[PDB]
Amino acid sequence: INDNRYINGINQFYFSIAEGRNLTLGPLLNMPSFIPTATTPEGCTRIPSFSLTKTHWCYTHNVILNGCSNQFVSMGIIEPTSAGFPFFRTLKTLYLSDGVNRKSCSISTVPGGCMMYCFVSTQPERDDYFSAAPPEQRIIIMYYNDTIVERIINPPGVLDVWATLNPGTGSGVYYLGWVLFPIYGGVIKGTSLWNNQANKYFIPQMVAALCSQNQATQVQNAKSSYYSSWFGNRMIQSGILACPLRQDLTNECLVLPFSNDQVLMGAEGRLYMYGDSVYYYQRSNSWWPMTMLYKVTITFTNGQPSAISAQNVPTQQVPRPGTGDCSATNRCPGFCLTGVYADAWLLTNPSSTSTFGSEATFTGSYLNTATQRINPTMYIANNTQIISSQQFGSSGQEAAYGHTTCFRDTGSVMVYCIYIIELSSSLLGQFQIVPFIRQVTLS
Amino acid sequence: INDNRYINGINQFYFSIAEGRNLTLGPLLNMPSFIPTATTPEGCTRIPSFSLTKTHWCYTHNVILNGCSNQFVSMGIIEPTSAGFPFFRTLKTLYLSDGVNRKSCSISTVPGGCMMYCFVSTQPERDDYFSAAPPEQRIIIMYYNDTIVERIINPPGVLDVWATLNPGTGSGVYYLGWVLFPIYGGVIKGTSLWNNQANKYFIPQMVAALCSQNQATQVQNAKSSYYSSWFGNRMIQSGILACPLRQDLTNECLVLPFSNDQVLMGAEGRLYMYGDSVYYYQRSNSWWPMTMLYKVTITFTNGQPSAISAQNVPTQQVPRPGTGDCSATNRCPGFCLTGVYADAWLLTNPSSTSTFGSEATFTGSYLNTATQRINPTMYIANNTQIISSQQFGSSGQEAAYGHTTCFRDTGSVMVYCIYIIELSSSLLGQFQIVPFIRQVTLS
Amino acid sequence: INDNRYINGINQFYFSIAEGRNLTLGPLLNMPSFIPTATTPEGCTRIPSFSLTKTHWCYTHNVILNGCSNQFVSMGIIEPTSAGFPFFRTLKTLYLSDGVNRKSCSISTVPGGCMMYCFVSTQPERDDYFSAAPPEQRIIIMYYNDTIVERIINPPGVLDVWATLNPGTGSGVYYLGWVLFPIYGGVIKGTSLWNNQANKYFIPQMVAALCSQNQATQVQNAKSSYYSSWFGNRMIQSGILACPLRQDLTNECLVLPFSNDQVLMGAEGRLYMYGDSVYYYQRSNSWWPMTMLYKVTITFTNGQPSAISAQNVPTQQVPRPGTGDCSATNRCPGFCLTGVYADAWLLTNPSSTSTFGSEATFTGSYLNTATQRINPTMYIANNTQIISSQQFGSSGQEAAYGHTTCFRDTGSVMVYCIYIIELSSSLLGQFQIVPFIRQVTLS
Amino acid sequence: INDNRYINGINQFYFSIAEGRNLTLGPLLNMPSFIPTATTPEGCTRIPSFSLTKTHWCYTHNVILNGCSNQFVSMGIIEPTSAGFPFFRTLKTLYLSDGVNRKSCSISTVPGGCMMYCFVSTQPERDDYFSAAPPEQRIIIMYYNDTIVERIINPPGVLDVWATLNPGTGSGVYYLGWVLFPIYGGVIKGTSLWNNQANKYFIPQMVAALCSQNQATQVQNAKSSYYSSWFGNRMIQSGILACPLRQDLTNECLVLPFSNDQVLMGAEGRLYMYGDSVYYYQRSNSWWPMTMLYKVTITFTNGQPSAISAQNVPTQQVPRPGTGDCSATNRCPGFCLTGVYADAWLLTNPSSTSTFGSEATFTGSYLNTATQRINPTMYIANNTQIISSQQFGSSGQEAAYGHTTCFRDTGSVMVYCIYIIELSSSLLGQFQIVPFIRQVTLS
Ligand SMILES: *[C@@H]1O[C@H](CO)[C@@H](O[C@@H]2O[C@H](CO)[C@@H](O)[C@H](O)[C@H]2NC(C)=O)[C@H](O)[C@H]1NC(C)=O
Ligand SMILES: *[C@@H]1O[C@H](CO)[C@@H](O[C@@H]2O[C@H](CO)[C@@H](O)[C@H](O)[C@H]2NC(C)=O)[C@H](O)[C@H]1NC(C)=O
Ligand SMILES: *[C@@H]1O[C@H](CO)[C@@H](O[C@@H]2O[C@H](CO)[C@@H](O)[C@H](O)[C@H]2NC(C)=O)[C@H](O)[C@H]1NC(C)=O
Ligand SMILES: *[C@@H]1O[C@H](CO)[C@@H](O[C@@H]2O[C@H](CO)[C@@H](O)[C@H](O)[C@H]2NC(C)=O)[C@H](O)[C@H]1NC(C)=O
Ligand SMILES: *[C@@H]1O[C@H](CO)[C@@H](O[C@@H]2O[C@H](CO)[C@@H](O)[C@H](O)[C@H]2NC(C)=O)[C@H](O)[C@H]1NC(C)=O
Ligand SMILES: *[C@@H]1O[C@H](CO)[C@@H](O[C@@H]2O[C@H](CO)[C@@H](O)[C@H](O)[C@H]2NC(C)=O)[C@H](O)[C@H]1NC(C)=O
Ligand SMILES: *[C@@H]1O[C@H](CO)[C@@H](O[C@@H]2O[C@H](CO)[C@@H](O)[C@H](O)[C@H]2NC(C)=O)[C@H](O)[C@H]1NC(C)=O
Ligand SMILES: *[C@H]1O[C@H](CO)[C@@H](O)[C@H](O)[C@H]1NC(C)=O
Ligand SMILES: *[C@H]1O[C@H](CO)[C@@H](O)[C@H](O)[C@H]1NC(C)=O
Ligand SMILES: *[C@H]1O[C@H](CO)[C@@H](O)[C@H](O)[C@H]1NC(C)=O
Ligand SMILES: *[C@H]1O[C@H](CO)[C@@H](O)[C@H](O)[C@H]1NC(C)=O
Ligand SMILES: [Ca+2]
Ligand SMILES: [Ca+2]
Ligand SMILES: [Ca+2]
Ligand SMILES: [Ca+2]
């Protein structure tokens, strides 16, 4: 279990609206990395997932022997060092290496262990969208007492509805007895979902002022952005997978898709917990290149999640490198299928302002360039501007995904955020996933 | 505990004299590294120590926050991956961060845990040699059941005899109920040790053929090489520290110095176990730049180690970068105080030939250059030549210490050696200690 | 169920056209044989059939007590050994010994067990062709829960149409709810089948360049090759038997003959599964002595197989020992009735080239001689040449049928092929059916 | 469970003294072999162990990949074929392949499964005798419900008493709640066992009439035959290992050595069950080259085996190939260390004659030659002559160990004996262990 200095500073909004205005990033602090490195120049470690909770943390990433498989799992606690800052102490390690190609895995903390959700890849991504059958889905529970239970799940409404289903790779969350995971995939034309989603679209609140197209043109393009001709003519859908914490899971997990009137085209994502509220981060793999965060309201019918609703925190801040007419400078609706995973952590409560998210502050990392996965930069920002930032390495430095997480030392009363970034390395391995850590200072 | 595939392939001579002649190194294999990385550009991780035994392994290294402290400890088991090669699974982690400057630590496996030996540094190395008082010594026992017992030891014959005492940083060994650690330091003039060591010297068997000085000149210079005017005019001594496995250690550990007629000037080192025989690796910090390995015979008087004797395995292979008239090309006796730690693992038994070590084969890493810590290269070699080698990275690549360890997969019947090398990194940290792993093929 | 290392490497094309060009056979590996041996010098074990699927494998062969009956059935899973290679673990054995002379049996894997198809022999083969009545047909289902259900089937269009009907002995396949088995026999003159097949013939694409007869002469001879005067003046027909997976089968199995415009004279054969496509191997018992493989397209009318279409993979590689003017050196059409069963496994997808099968790669075993069943040799070959081969035993070594099957270890990422060959033995039994296994290396 | 035709014909004396006189061997019958074959020319399958009981049978043998490791285990039942003779139906298979070198394994049937006893070899046999420490011992229980429990046992009175301990490789037996295994090894000079065994010797009853030395010379030589200077100067001891049927065995198994006044020098062996009496077969690895069988009387003190007593069945029949002055023609006491394992099954009760074993009849296989492991021959014999025999293969045919077992078909009322012989093969593998089966006819 985590040290008393952290058990009460996890999964919360740490600053008040007023304080958020005076927040800045401190120097990067040096701690022993809990994320394993490759031991060959061509080894590839990618797609990390990190979950932290009151009692402990869970970590995992994919390992491919030659170029960019096995799945490395880690788990432990946080404890203070004599310098005052954290040390992620690993208490158990696991390496799922057995021939099953588990990919796009999302991990979540659960009482006594970690629950991981992966899908079994057996062909190029695109082929998964064309094949009417969905890839195999698996949820592995790994207890700290070293028991391991892996199950091949078959949730209702997936077969013959989703041509593919993938976990979002971002952390899932343990909520009211269930483990929720972000998911996405392609839905088949003619299905109820497809029909119920028909004619729906979502346009971020700050698009109008920045887009040059008219309201009617924008609406038409936005509607079309949820369908991909390149990916088997499927409706790219974002959603949540809810599994009850059991060791005999089969078809009890439920697929809850987001309404396309509240969310953009399906993509990778992450689920958060700020107090009793669930939040969702949706990668911007469509036309809008800015950070997308939503407050998720979950409805339970008879002790079972029956529907989800998402409210976007309106921003125009922190763009992501895209390709073509969907670079970080795009502002107009249309169909796009490019981007990067770059989640953000809300240091301030969006519900604290009279108008939801009118003044929000978040932190994370992003690749500062319009079309290249280059110039990784850690930052703090509000809805319209970046109020603090520090690029890592010299310009041209290649990077990829970035998972950010913050917690507070209730002893010293300071917030530390960990920025897990995939860095292109020149010495060992294709990428080196680094758990950068620094403080978020008030002043 | 280690997997059944390794429990019977540890601490042994794996090949016969005949087989050693046809051994070559395989490609480097990619496994998740169990050695933690720095998270800042200037963070320094150095001085590793690794001990592997039938049941498990222990690992540790020093961490300094800005440039080249805290001590990271790790422990776990070995298990096969679906590719056939090993995966060092960490089962527990520890970070000794509390203000005590533990340095030059050596670690050893012990039943149920790890025993580490460090000294507390409070001033520049040189000052330790001038001060008549020796630094404080500590042995920490860390059990897998998470109990930790640290003791400040005071072995007899240290106070007022040794101006300084340091662990060799190389792994110690658990032998017949005792934990043995390599040690070295400076002895004060006028002491019994100094007197008993008076006029003693050691000249490697293959020096004559390579040295141009005459037998009388060589003898005179060799005698003088054990005294350093730069390090407080002390006799630089190599030796072994033997501690009985107890949780209340005070003054039961015994300091057993090597006779200077059998060993070169004191330096860092490592202890090994090949079956029932103990072996010692002595860093070449003096005039002779080649790998020094000795078969150690331990004498017990009344259940207590009373004396050690060392027999050198004669070689002229694998030089180490030195400074001035003590580069890798030096062959003549004199006083030197330069070099690097580069241990070697004996893949063949030296006692198997009629004349001890007439045909020996060893493997390890070495810096291929005469005076610079550059061009790290993993190799296999006999007494006079390198029969297999592969440099890592492009020329100019900086590196430092290298700790090598081999074991066998009794399932697939192949030997794997792990080459832990301190690599100068350009991205994260001053150095990146990497646990390179590859196979030693017969053919 | 099979180990996770194989569940996803079964019934697929393992290499790309480009990779197929650099494939070679590895050394034979030693595993415990799952095929039972005779215990007397004259005992005869012959005619094996092997089916492997995602979950498990099925095996069977005929046993005759004195010289060349009972039917041995076996079933199990595949699991890795500490050497990395497979071990076919038998989980159940059966010996059908009850007075019913079940011959020419083909076996196929089915969910939860094996389905075997045999015919009851009561007289010399030739007599079966002269008698207007067809031998009795039986399909036995053997569940892993040890239930056994044998049925005497009577499919429509057999009585008074086929003077005889035999399973091809090669494995059948479980496809979309039905079990398909290769069949062959003789059709009576004057029947619809005979009439619809009238004037049809098939000439392999690579015959012209190798045959010296002119297009008109070849066509005439090919037409006549489907009729045997020696076997009761019947049209020797090849085909597929499709049975729905039921325990009360009577007349629901359907006989689907191949068009004689797409296939050569009827003979033994085997059915395969490469992804969602069905393939057929037709023994060369007629004039063309080279390996015959066809991609089978199955048409369903009202949930029932209604017609099959076959597309040949054009080759001139891997000949088979024949008699007279039909040796391995024959290239001209005519009537022949000699050959051996020697199937081949496609390591490459024939549909991957713009022109179907323009560059195909297959592996298997063949008897390297023109007219004798001698010199068994395992090989890898493309359409025109053998790119890798290794003969077994010394020249003159007698052998017979060869059934080849390949799968992949998704853990180590290597393909293993099993070459089941009937070997003439000198010690125990007439033949020793051996399951040779080796790897197919890329490089 | 076995068929009703055999459940009541196992582990008994099948013939009366009078009937034994008219017994002859029938022709070898052909059944599917339940003993797996090697799949490479150099693969080595050796050292089989077979246990048959009322309910089922257990089988196992050692597998070495190149030349003469893993351990193959098999288990099943016996059922009649339509020819009337048996068919050993395998119901489960296991392959212990994990890097642990389990050798000299003995197997025994136990309720619900098989219990196997092996020792872990890590060095040449001879070295085990010189090292004061005994090899590691293991007993593996394998249940038909597929549970497997392996334990590293440490019975009292082994450490520092036996320099080595090996199972006899012959089948053990389940007796009154305990599993008994034959064992042998070398005892250290100066131990209680050594002292209690001092001056003891055993001379077979029929030696005098055949030996030319006098009673005093014979006694002196016999005493010395229990000590081997070649095997570390140890007393070669034969004995029984008794383990209570538990899944948590540690030190409950008991080592019960035979008195050297009743048994010859230690060697491999087998334990039998004839009704309620236990019998022991001791390989003739010493001076006397004839078959050694003893009726074992076991004493229990407080529900625990406390002592064993052996009564020899006096014979001079069925010699075994030995080396030097210990060939099959030797009859004089002295020290020898050569021979072969060739057990025998008692078809007649030795206690049925007024004088124990005055007229005994046994069957088995033996190598008919004086010093070579050649000419395997199955036979039936009384104390002084071979009344029936049939050699296998042509002269010169190499073979090795032979394990014989008989049971009765209470339905047809005939006895079948299975002769498991290691045959040197020319086609596949070094040896082919064959389960020959034939009937023992009365008339
Ligand atoms: C490790 O912890 C888990 C979690 O408590 C244990 O899981 C229990 O497993 C049994 C069946 O094996 C279930 O009936 C219990 O309900 C589970 N507990 C719950 C509610 O989580 C697991 O057994 C533990 N490992 C052991 C046996 O030491
Ligand atoms: C995000 O932060 C920026 C920078 O702090 C805010 O911009 C400032 O707005 C105040 C008005 O409240 C002006 O006095 C400053 O001059 C602005 N800074 C400059 C020079 O850019 C911005 O308003 C914030 N966005 C919100 C309201 O959340
Ligand atoms: C963790 O393991 C160690 C090693 O067994 C335990 O150490 C024992 O400690 C007590 C005093 O606390 C000694 O008297 C024993 O002799 C020690 N055992 C020996 C011989 O090593 C330690 O107690 C264990 N931790 C716990 C209490 O769970
Ligand atoms: C160390 O290895 C080298 C290289 O294998 C040995 O040198 C070879 O010695 C043999 C004689 O035994 C010669 O036939 C070769 O020509 C030598 N190799 C070459 C060309 O350098 C060397 O002898 C070995 N050192 C020993 C004896 O341990
Ligand atoms: C062994 O498995 C088979 C396959 O499931 C069982 O077969 C069932 O048999 C009943 C009639 O006996 C049918 O009505 C079911 O439809 C069959 N199941 C199907 C659909 O395959 C068989 O009963 C099992 N053996 C037992 C009874 O344990
Ligand atoms: C089958 O394999 C053979 C051997 O690899 C191919 O023949 C080679 O063809 C290339 C041209 O692509 C030539 O450069 C080589 O010289 C040929 N090898 C020799 C010397 O025989 C053959 O073309 C392959 N058949 C196909 C096209 O599938
Ligand atoms: C073992 O069997 C042999 C052969 O049957 C016995 O020898 C026979 O003994 C009888 C006397 O009872 C003579 O009439 C025969 O002539 C002997 N057979 C020959 C010609 O060798 C022998 O006695 C048996 N051994 C015993 C007594 O167990
Ligand atoms: C942050 O700093 C500003 C400027 O120094 C100060 O006016 C403001 O009150 C601070 N915010 C709070 C309330 O912490
Ligand atoms: C090693 O290889 C050489 C050359 O192929 C061979 O002659 C030698 O016997 C091998 N060494 C051994 C005995 O393994
Ligand atoms: C196979 O080997 C050849 C020759 O080394 C190489 O050129 C070719 O690229 C390889 N094929 C592939 C793409 O795997
Ligand atoms: C065995 O055969 C002999 C000779 O035919 C006969 O005299 C004897 O009674 C038989 N033994 C018995 C009693 O079965
Ligand atoms: Ca799909
Ligand atoms: Ca000092
Ligand atoms: Ca007929
Ligand atoms: Ca020993």
Swiss-Prot record, chains A, B, C, D:
<keyword id="KW-1161">Viral attachment to host cell</keyword>
<feature type="disulfide bond">
    <location>
        <begin position="105"/>
        <end position="118"/>
    </location>
</feature>
<feature type="topological domain" description="Virion surface">
    <location>
        <begin position="1"/>
        <end position="443"/>
    </location>
</feature>
<dbReference type="GO" id="GO:0055036">
    <property type="term" value="C:virion membrane"/>
</dbReference>
<comment type="function">
    <text>Neuraminidase activity ensures the efficient spread of the virus by dissociating the mature virions from the neuraminic acid containing glycoproteins.</text>
</comment>
<keyword id="KW-0735">Signal-anchor</keyword>
<feature type="disulfide bond">
    <location>
        <begin position="406"/>
        <end position="417"/>
    </location>
</feature>
<dbReference type="GO" id="GO:0016020">
    <property type="term" value="C:membrane"/>
</dbReference>
<protein>
    <recommendedName>
        <fullName>Hemagglutinin-neuraminidase</fullName>
        <ecNumber>3.2.1.18</ecNumber>
    </recommendedName>
</protein>
<keyword id="KW-1133">Transmembrane helix</keyword>
<feature type="glycosylation site" description="N-linked (GlcNAc...) asparagine; by host">
    <location>
        <position position="145"/>
    </location>
</feature>
<feature type="glycosylation site" description="N-linked (GlcNAc...) asparagine; by host">
    <location>
        <position position="382"/>
    </location>
</feature>
<keyword id="KW-0348">Hemagglutinin</keyword>
<comment type="similarity">
    <text>Belongs to the paramyxoviruses hemagglutinin-neuraminidase family.</text>
</comment>
<keyword id="KW-1160">Virus entry into host cell</keyword>
<dbReference type="GO" id="GO:0046718">
    <property type="term" value="P:symbiont entry into host cell"/>
</dbReference>
<keyword id="KW-1032">Host cell membrane</keyword>
<dbReference type="GO" id="GO:0004308">
    <property type="term" value="F:exo-alpha-sialidase activity"/>
</dbReference>
<comment type="subunit">
    <text>Homotetramer; composed of disulfide-linked homodimers. Interacts with F protein trimer.</text>
</comment>
<feature type="disulfide bond">
    <location>
        <begin position="58"/>
        <end position="114"/>
    </location>
</feature>
<keyword id="KW-0946">Virion</keyword>
<keyword id="KW-0261">Viral envelope protein</keyword>
<keyword id="KW-0812">Transmembrane</keyword>
<keyword id="KW-1015">Disulfide bond</keyword>
<dbReference type="GO" id="GO:0042802">
    <property type="term" value="F:identical protein binding"/>
</dbReference>
<comment type="function">
    <text>Attaches the virus to sialic acid-containing cell receptors and thereby initiating infection. Binding of HN protein to the receptor induces a conformational change that allows the F protein to trigger virion/cell membranes fusion.</text>
</comment>
<feature type="disulfide bond">
    <location>
        <begin position="326"/>
        <end position="336"/>
    </location>
</feature>
<keyword id="KW-0325">Glycoprotein</keyword>
<feature type="disulfide bond">
    <location>
        <begin position="44"/>
        <end position="68"/>
    </location>
</feature>
<feature type="disulfide bond">
    <location>
        <begin position="243"/>
        <end position="253"/>
    </location>
</feature>
<dbReference type="GO" id="GO:0019062">
    <property type="term" value="P:virion attachment to host cell"/>
</dbReference>
<keyword id="KW-1043">Host membrane</keyword>
<keyword id="KW-0472">Membrane</keyword>
<dbReference type="GO" id="GO:0019031">
    <property type="term" value="C:viral envelope"/>
</dbReference>
<dbReference type="GO" id="GO:0046789">
    <property type="term" value="F:host cell surface receptor binding"/>
</dbReference>
<dbReference type="GO" id="GO:0046761">
    <property type="term" value="P:viral budding from plasma membrane"/>
</dbReference>
<dbReference type="GO" id="GO:0020002">
    <property type="term" value="C:host cell plasma membrane"/>
</dbReference>
<feature type="glycosylation site" description="N-linked (GlcNAc...) asparagine; by host">
    <location>
        <position position="22"/>
    </location>
</feature>
<feature type="region of interest" description="Involved in neuraminidase activity">
    <location>
        <begin position="101"/>
        <end position="106"/>
    </location>
</feature>
<keyword id="KW-0945">Host-virus interaction</keyword>
<keyword id="KW-0378">Hydrolase</keyword>
<feature type="disulfide bond">
    <location>
        <begin position="211"/>
        <end position="332"/>
    </location>
</feature>
